[PDB]
DNA sequence: AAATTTGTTTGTTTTTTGAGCAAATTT
DNA sequence: AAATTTGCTCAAAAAACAAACAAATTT
């Protein structure tokens, strides 16, 4: 059904899958909960950055550091990959 | 004084630990363990679109949640997300959420 | 009655892109 | 020895943009 899921455990010690989107939801819920009233400036180019670093780190781990297949997997350009690596400093 | 808070820890997701103790680990790891498992129960398939798949998993809620928090007001959400109002409407239309 | 926010468009800039290429590196 | 992947440059096509509004809606 859903390809992107994380394990969870309920009180009765049952491990159990759940969509990733359900964490992100929680993630944020909590963020907002936190700041009472403090304007939020850059929420998009934040969460992105907290989701690209792992995607990158991991779809390189999986390709043995082959930037070319790396890109083919991610469906984006050999170039823009080198950029995104520079951005988080990985290349 | 203000204790430091790393970015790792600015977006967190509660988890149970080795001493069934409730700790608070970065979203990062969710995205991390999510892809680990996506590879595991994969094998050999042509995977040409991995970026977009992740993205459309992360954009949906970000929008889902930001809109609920501005009780419908785009102009804010857009300003709050640090993105052009046009491109907000674009993204919305993509997932519904109109 | 204001004032804001919506729904459009019109043009510019910033980003992504393919397609080349020598040099380096893996097979 | 051969195939490939890097690191770069170019130009082209595409996505994001800010600035303008009238019409709609909310303060």
Swiss-Prot record, chain A:
Residues 67-86 bind DNA. The keyword Cytoplasm applies. It comes from the Bacteria. SUPFAM superfamilies: Homeodomain-like (SSF46689). Residues 10-37 are annotated as: Required for the stimulation of HIN-mediated recombination. GO terms for molecular function: core promoter sequence-specific DNA binding; DNA binding; DNA-binding transcription activator activity; DNA-binding transcription repressor activity; protein homodimerization activity; sequence-specific DNA binding; sequence-specific DNA binding, bending; transcription cis-regulatory region binding. Keywords: Activator, Cytoplasm, DNA-binding, Transcription, Transcription regulation. InterPro entries: Fis_DNA-bd (IPR005412), Homeodomain-like_sf (IPR009057), HTH_Fis (IPR002197), Trans_regulatory_Fis (IPR050207). Homodimer. Belongs to the transcriptional regulatory Fis family. This is DNA-binding protein Fis.
